[PDB]
Amino acid sequence: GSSLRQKLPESVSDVRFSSPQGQGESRTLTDSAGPRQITLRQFENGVTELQLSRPPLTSLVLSGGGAKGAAYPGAMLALEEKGMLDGIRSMSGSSAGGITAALLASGMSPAAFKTLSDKMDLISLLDSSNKIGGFSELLLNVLPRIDSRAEPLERLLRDETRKAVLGQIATHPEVARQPTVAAIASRLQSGSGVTFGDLDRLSAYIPQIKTLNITGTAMFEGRPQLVVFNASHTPDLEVAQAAHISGSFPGVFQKVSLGVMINVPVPEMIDKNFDSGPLRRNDNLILEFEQLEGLEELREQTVVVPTMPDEIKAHLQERLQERVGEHLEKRLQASERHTFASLDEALLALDDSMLTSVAQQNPEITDGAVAFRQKARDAFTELTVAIVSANGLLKLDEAMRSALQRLDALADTPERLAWLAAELNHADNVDHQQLLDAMRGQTVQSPVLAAALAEAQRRKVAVIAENIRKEVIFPSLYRPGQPDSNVALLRRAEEQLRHATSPAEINQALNDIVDNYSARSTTVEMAKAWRNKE
Amino acid sequence: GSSLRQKLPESVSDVRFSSPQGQGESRTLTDSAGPRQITLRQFENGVTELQLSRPPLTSLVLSGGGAKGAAYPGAMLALEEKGMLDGIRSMSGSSAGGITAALLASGMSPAAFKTLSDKMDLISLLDSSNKIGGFSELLLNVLPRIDSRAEPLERLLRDETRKAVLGQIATHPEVARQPTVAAIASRLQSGSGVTFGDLDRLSAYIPQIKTLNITGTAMFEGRPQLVVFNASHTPDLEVAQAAHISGSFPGVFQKVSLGVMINVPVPEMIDKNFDSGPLRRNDNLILEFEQLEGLEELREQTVVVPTMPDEIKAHLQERLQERVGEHLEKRLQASERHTFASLDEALLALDDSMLTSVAQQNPEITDGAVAFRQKARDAFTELTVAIVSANGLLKLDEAMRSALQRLDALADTPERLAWLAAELNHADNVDHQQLLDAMRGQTVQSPVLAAALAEAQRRKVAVIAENIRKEVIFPSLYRPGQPDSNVALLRRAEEQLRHATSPAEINQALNDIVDNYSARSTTVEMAKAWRNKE
Amino acid sequence: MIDTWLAQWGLRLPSSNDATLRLQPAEGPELVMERLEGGWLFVVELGLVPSGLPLGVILQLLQVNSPFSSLAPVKLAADDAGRLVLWAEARDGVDDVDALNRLHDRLREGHSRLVPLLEPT
Amino acid sequence: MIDTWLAQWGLRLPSSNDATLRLQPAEGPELVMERLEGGWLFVVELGLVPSGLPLGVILQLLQVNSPFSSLAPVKLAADDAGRLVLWAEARDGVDDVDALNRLHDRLREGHSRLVPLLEPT
């Protein structure tokens, strides 16, 4: 449990390295295998070292502030220029960049976007010539109420987005014919704006449509609050509405009844996800103005660009172009290292593709691992046929037992049992989840199922903790008046919460706060409220 | 309040030495003046440094333990050999040395004592062939009850003491004729033992009779307790009884109803006294076995000697003789240094004698100080005539006012006002105390009286604190099981108490204890009891 | 000189060495050693500071940092996450095997002394 | 080199120097300097540790001792009497005027920051 910062002596007998560390000469088991250049080195004492190309660029995080979003098309060009704009599957922006990523997710081609930003850098500057639950669902519920429907910004975005999305639909007439798509474009042509729900729904068909996450931080009661608009929380709300709402510098709370601050801290946009193993699944290009994903690893993924005329804005679309150009080729020559305590552990860390690559190249190494993977993938289907045919009529019939028996047989080391449990936890997999939800709290014959169930509850507990961090801590932690004493307490509650494995530990987090926070009331209430609810 | 143990920087402007420290060349105002060799050096900036011979040897502290008190006559000889046994006015012993100093205070000449110790080193070894308020007045009240009157040790001591005292009385037939003495020796010849009350009463007449203090530490309830026998607490109790009681290694508590440990820590025997100034009034010869009077200053005054035959006991009476011989001549060539912030401050630190010596030698220096001393000594008599003639009939008549006016006139600097207050606080001076007791709590016209009264309450408060240290702290602090955490707390309560100037601060000391002591009950009760009483 | 301190357990400072190594001895606390400008930082973890400590315990904690403590030069602190830590600082040049062996022992001595003061709270 | 540190206030290290000197500047805490084997010990007093401190305060206290604190190398401790103390250690040889001037400032910075955390308790 690591340490974060920013007379003769009687002998100590024999001492190992608590982590795995290669000792002695290494042989190379597999050199550069596959698209992701898998290298395996193995040492005299077993320890296997994995080296592998940086993950695929699948995400774009756009940080807000200022008005300077006339530089933004610099990058956009740099992306299609080197041709990895296709490869993006997600876009995330706050404040001023909140609008920009809207435009882009909507499917606005690189050249298309620019001309708009050259009549936008007027508008973005003229809007600066203008200038229980939480403060999230009480926004999520205040929208349909007393808010002026469509402004100059809402209209313009509504249309920009609606053009891109509708345009892509046509270039791809193979998808246009699919019911659900043709349902969406008849909505769009009726005058409706693009939602997240469908930006999402369209990114599965066409790869030039991207998902959207717009983050923003609203002051209430001196206490900044995180607010998220994305496919999951605000699915049918319109992309235009949100990007404008998060245009609101500090914004009015309608007075509804019962470094600096404009920054949403970078890591509050990047997503928490449960990867089956120690491998990161993707990379972020983080554009900024002026598996704890650390400062140091985030720096590595962040390029930071250094009354506006029309030629200085070009300059800025060149400086950016060029930095976001060197990065992308450099990032192509850098790596990831992961150290394991055994070969099989490191073959477990690879997805089936990667495994298959190493296998092509050096089959002597992997035959065991491919054998195991094959049997697991079989047993997991076999188990799914069971779950489904049981709905035909909860009760673990024999067929599930048999497949759980087949899985139990594969878990002949602690490493593989862990892998088999995680595999059975994929939130995405409705049928497996169907079964874990059912055996929740139960004692089961099968070890694998027993693992999987425990793993499930750990996750349940982690989201609860994460929710509390976001709504009891985050607001206090960044209250401007906050005496350092108070900050110390909460920076500690965060630590407690990070490592919380059981509801009881979560309770203790909150009590530490109730017992020790000096109103020097609300945070304390807030906490009390979390402590009593299930 | 001292510490006990065992980017450009923005400037700090002008900084003095918080204590006085001589800076620059010194002149010598007065070289070796008088019996006590007074030297005054004065520096360019005013600071006057005093150097003076170590104080008179007036006290003998005898530490207990073992049976090895057959070495003791080594020193006794060394004392009369160099001839400073006369000069002793006090004797203080614990455990095994508790007997020894009894014998000596009783007036037993050096040679006399030895022959006894050569039939005592049998007896002292045969007794090892044998082997609200507090545990102090419940001893002080358990004595006259169910205790076997006179044992072999009680008898032998009763007589040794009674011989010496009665013998001295005769050699000095000028005192024998005085009523009070002739009252005491008719008691002694009647079969009564020597008390403290009279050992005291006789030391004023004859200088070969010494006072006695016997300290001892009794375990009760695992909790060691300090117990004192002296002229003030147990005046009429017999010297013999006590020295035997404190012969009791750990001793039985009759079961009456409602480094190591045998050591009474050295400083619990040496006396707390309120000297009018920064000068120590006397020295201790501390014999040990194996104005915070510090470790370091106590070391300086402590010489530490390194089935018993009769010739090895001689050896020991020679080793001691010789060390207690080198000491006494060395101590004669060592000094005391005191630094003051002005001449007059250092002339204030001298008693009238010392003053008079410096005056003989360098009258230009002192005329002012002798002028002031003369007028103070006059005004203090003048005030005493007032107090007394008022008893003739509480109410400050004019005559007291006049003398208080004369004193107020002398206090023309903060240093002298302090001196004048302390002078008026001499506990020994019944008439002054008569007046301070009367104006207690009152607001008075005279500044000097206002000082004196404040000074009085400070002292009242210090004895209370000292009492608590001795009976709430001391017992817990040296409980054998005591976890260091607990020790830290009390070592701190001691600190609080040391610096306590008002009853309110004393209350807080005790609360710190109630609030923070882990029974890991009694100390806490004990404290509660002190906190409620006036 | 660190590498010869290691050497005595038949361990060797691992190639491509980065930030933090962690040694776990057969008895007692894990030892975390970061690496610095010109020296290593040894550290031992004692858990998150507990709520409701009694004064005396607080005191015994603070007293670990007196320049005269029996544990010198080991220091007691908390990291930014509120985790109570004993640490010392081994410099290249200055220190050597015997000296590192001392640091280590003083850390284990500090850890055993204090560790029961927190738990029972 | 201490004597030339002194010199800048027109003070001079007093002859027949013994254990403890005490400097009182025109603003701010008194500075106690004991003398050691081959160096001086600067110390600043913050009062006796209070009873009933809240956790966060305890934490901010402990955090003063992280090897990375803005006050390094000044340390926070309590003496045997339970008195809360900031101290640093100036060696002969190593340190000099500019360096001693730093220690001093870090002590005053530490004292002003913390001193209000105790009083109001």
Residue numbers in the entry:
A (entry chain B), B (entry chain B): 28 to 33, 54 to 178, 202 to 328, 346 to 377, 411 to 426, 445 to 531, 535 to 661, 672 to 685
C (entry chain A), D (entry chain A): 1 to 121
From the reporting publication:
ExoU is a 687-residue protein that, once translocated through the T3SS, induces cytotoxic effects leading to rapid necrotic cell death; exoU knockout P. aeruginosa strains display greatly decreased virulence in mouse models of acute infection. Notably, ExoU has been shown to carry phospholipase activity with broad substrate specificity which relies on an essential catalytic dyad (Ser142/Asp344), as is the case for other phospholipases. ExoU is expressed by approximately 30% of clinical strains, 90% of which cause acute illness. It is encoded on a pathogenicity island together with its cognate chaperone SpcU, which is required for ExoU's efficient secretion from the bacterial cytoplasm. ExoU forms a 1∶1 complex with SpcU, and folds into three distinct domains, which fulfill catalytic, bridging, and membrane-binding functions.
The structure of the ExoU(30–687)∶SpcU(1–127) complex was solved to a resolution of 2.94 Å by performing a SAD experiment on the selenium edge at the ESRF synchrotron in Grenoble, and harbors a 1∶1 complex in the asymmetric unit. SpcU is a typical type IA chaperone, being composed of a curved, 5-stranded sheet flanked by α-helices. One involves the extremity of the 5-stranded β-sheet, which binds a short β-strand located at the N-terminus of ExoU (residues 62–64), thus generating a 6-stranded sheet. Residues 106–471 delimit the catalytic, phospholipase domain, which is composed of an α/β hydrolase fold with a 6-stranded central β-sheet surrounded by 10 α-helices. The catalytic serine (Ser142) is located at an elbow between β6 and the following helix, in a funnel-like region surrounded by a number of flexible loops. A triple glycine sequence (Gly111, 112, 113), in close proximity, provides its backbone atoms as an oxyanion hole that potentially stabilizes the charge of the transition state intermediate in the phospholipase reaction. In the structure of ExoU, this region is also found to be flexible, and the catalytic aspartate (Asp344) is not traceable in the electron density map, suggesting not only that ExoU could also harbor a ‘cap’ region, but that the structure presented here is in the ‘open ’, and potentially inactive, conformation. Our structure reveals that the C-terminus of ExoU forms a distinct domain (encompassing residues 588–687) that folds into a 4-helical bundle. Interestingly, residues 679, 682, and 683 form a polar, mostly basic ‘backbone’ that could bind to negatively charged eukaryotic phospholipids, and facilitate lipid bilayer recognition. In summary, the structure of ExoU presented here reveals the toxin in its chaperone-bound, inactive, pre-secretion conformation.
